[PDB]
């Protein structure tokens, strides 16, 4: 009977692949052949933030595109003012094994977690003047791979036990659980409206979830190995995934299939972070070969390279207004490029 | 050029910077050990000998004027490939292994495979291992009862504690391909005296001496 279920699943997969092939009449690259190349993009480092004493594992831009939080497993959450390079806050964490950080859209809270299996929320605007942890959300059983704020009271966290979760910060309990992944979840990406989000896991599949009802809508396959990063296209109808196969794949929610692959035989290192520009014409891919790359999303040819780091680019982000791109590496230096 | 209210911000930035620099200076004097094992490998026994939160558990203590911070990954139940690289800078890797599990695909072979995987690693090409061999008191009666060859088909020798233990030790220590850039210490940890902590202290002293030599340039 189990063999019967497996056979039915395989037949369903075959039917789905056949349907996708029937719907894959063309690809993005050909229809954009008449668009002139963006040219050689040569960004320069306008700032360098040097306060961390260990590897940088997460950074997140503020909604005002000036302040940014960054987490390092020296045990510190440092909030930088990128305009003036001043350290606004330096929160000491209870567990130094931080793997993720979040800056609330309102700017009032930050969140971080990691191998401690707990997501801690820090209140930045307490009257006492000292940042203090307001809630320790403990309902996971694995490392907190990522976390993101829906608002000042809702947070989504994807963990290493293969389940994502939606929390109620005030009550400290788990509001909803998102199950359906087979391998560890490595990233999260809220949609522009924050109604639905995509999570990438080690199964090489990115799953679409609707926050309110807590179901899974779609599964996107096409990667040959794990997915390290996932970014939502600003339009909110597509998202780009970076994988260990040195390939960045563009996926569409409506078509439910891959639109483009950004790779060339020269580069054989896995991705670590992916992010789009404000207009979506550029895809910024942080690599483990120490060199960030800038892909012309409409042409797939390398628009440029960002080589200013001496270790893995662990995190990459773009200001909400698209003015600058912050890259944080394992050498403890953030660099703002523009 | 700077507003009267911006120089205060710069002063706060500098004060935070000099606070976190001294915090890192303090952290640089901590001996970070990573505890590893499998099943009932006696890791609880090692913690007891030394002496709410799922995942990594940190235990800090001081012995003979040195501060140890033992990180027991414990029940992570997750792909180690995605969270082991954060321990690249650890000082030493304590590795507990049961010797009464030679009877029980085998538990000894599982431990051996885990040891090989975590010893020959992209990130632990220099960190020294400290192998603990637990439960020798019980393994004594177990080897008196049944032969060890049931676990090692190639084993050739007598069915005695000293030789069985020597063979197990040699089999574990032969798994490291890079014998020149990292050493594998060993101690039959069932010893209930303070030797259990003394051996770790000696191994960490040797490792830090080697690191200091490498920095100075002698090595």
């Amino acid at each position, epitope marked *: 009977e189990l063999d019967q279920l497996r056979q039915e699943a395989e037949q369903l997969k075959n039917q789905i692949r056949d349907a996708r092939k029937a719907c894959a009449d063309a690809t993005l690259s050909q229809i954009t052949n008449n668009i002139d190349p963006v040219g050689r993009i040569q960004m320069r480092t306008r700032r360098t933030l040097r306060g961390h004493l260990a590897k940088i594992y997460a950074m997140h831009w503020g909604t005002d595109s000036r302040l940014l939080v960054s987490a390092s497993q020296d045990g510190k959450l440092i909030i930088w*003012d990128s305009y003036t390079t001043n350290k606004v806050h330096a929160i000491p964490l209870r567990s130094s094994w931080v793997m993720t950080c979040a800056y609330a859209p309102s700017g009032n809270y930050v969140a971080c977690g990691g191998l401690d299996n707990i997501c801690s929320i820090y209140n930045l605007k307490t009257r006492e003047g000292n940042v203090r942890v307001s809630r320790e959300l403990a309902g996971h059983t694995g490392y907190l791979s990522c976390c993101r704020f829906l608002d000042d009271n809702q947070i989504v966290t994807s963990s290493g036990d293969t389940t994502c979760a939606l929390w109620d910060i005030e009550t400290g309990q788990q509001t909803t659980t998102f199950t359906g992944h087979t391998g560890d979840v490595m990233s999260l990406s809220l949609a522009p409206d924050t109604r639905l989000f995509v999570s990438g896991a080690c199964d090489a599949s990115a799953k679409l979830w609707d926050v309110r009802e807590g179901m899974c809508r779609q599964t996107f396959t096409g990667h040959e190995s794990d997915i390290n990063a996932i970014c939502f296209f600003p339009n909110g109808n597509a998202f780009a995934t970076g994988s260990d196969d040195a390939t960045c794949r563009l996926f569409d929610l409506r078509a439910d299939q891959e639109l483009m692959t950004y790779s060339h035989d020269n580069i054989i290192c896995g991705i670590t972070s992916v992010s789009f520009s404000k207009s979506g014409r550029l895809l910024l891919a942080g690599y483990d070969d120490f060199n960030c790359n800038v892909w012309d999303a409409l042409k797939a040819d390398r628009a440029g390279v960002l080589a200013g780091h001496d270790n893995r680019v662990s995190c990459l982000g773009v200001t909400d207004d698209g003015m600058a791109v912050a890259t944080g590496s394992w050498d403890s230096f953030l660099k703002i490029w523009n | 050029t700077l507003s009267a209210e911006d120089k*205060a911000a710069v*002063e706060r930035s500098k004060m935070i910077d000099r606070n976190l620099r001294e915090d890192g200076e303090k952290a640089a004097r901590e001996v970070k050990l990573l505890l590893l094992g499998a099943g009932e490998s006696g890791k609880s026994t090692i913690v007891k000998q030394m002496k709410k939160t799922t995942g990594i558990v940190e235990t800090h203590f001081t012995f003979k004027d040195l501060h140890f911070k033992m990180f027991d990954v414990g029940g992570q139940r997750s792909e180690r490939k995605k969270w082991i690289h954060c321990f690249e800078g650890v000082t030493a890797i304590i590795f507990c292994v049961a010797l009464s599990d030679y009877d029980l695909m085998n538990r000894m072979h599982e431990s051996m495979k885990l040891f090989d995987s975590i010893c020959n690693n992209k990130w632990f090409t220099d960190t020294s291992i400290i192998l603990f061999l637990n439960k020798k008191d019980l393994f004594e009666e177990k080897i008196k009862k049944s032969p060890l060859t049931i676990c090692y088909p190639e084993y050739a020798g007598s069915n005695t504690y000293e030789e069985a233990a020597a063979y197990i030790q040699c089999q574990f220590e032969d798994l490291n391909k890079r014998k020149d850039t990292k050493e594998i210490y060993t101690h039959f940890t069932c010893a209930t005296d303070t030797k259990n902590v003394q051996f770790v202290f000696d191994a960490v002293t040797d490792v830090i001496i080697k690191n200091n030599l490498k920095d100075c340039g002698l090595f």
Partner: antibody
Amino acid sequence: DVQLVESGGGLVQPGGSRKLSCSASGFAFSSFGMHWVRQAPEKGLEWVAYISSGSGTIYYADTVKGRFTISRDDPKNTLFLQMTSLRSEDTAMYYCVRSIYYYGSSPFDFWGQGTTLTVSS
Amino acid sequence: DIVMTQATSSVPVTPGESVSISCRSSKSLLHSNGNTYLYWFLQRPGQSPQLLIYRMSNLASGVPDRFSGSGSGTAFTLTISRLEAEDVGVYYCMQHLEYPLTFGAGTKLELKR
């Protein structure tokens, strides 16, 4: 709750000296810069002194420079203003004010209840 | 120093009606970094002052929303949309662009009957 309780006020002859104390409770005293601001009887406010966080920078009003010394004991959560060569114009209510300076902070967000100093012969 | 000028007193107004308090500085308070450094404080009868506005447009925590700040580089206004019996007292404008910090004369908002 945040509290700044002042003490040391009273009657002083002209030319004397007096120490005003500000006991801070309910907040991280060491993270805040501090100000002393004086209000003359039936008159407006006048800024007197400022001591940064950690005592790294100090400023005085020209009317008091050289005569007042501002200090802080962080371990005891206390702020001190020692006044020497008091004049008749120095009679007033002295307020202890906290002020934290960074991006987006709100300086001058809390004032003490003030202590009355009467410099008269 | 920077000289802050206000009216000695404002016309008394009834509760529920809007009211405005003006202040002006001898020099432009608009720093090159975009921040206009000006703070508005309230001192009620027999009490210590308390911050109302900081940097000319930002409402301090715990202050009712009716209070609002505005103004150009060298002219500033604090508006109370609907007065209450608890708004009576002295309103001070203070500049933080350069040391020393110079307050204003203080406008004494008082009720009408």
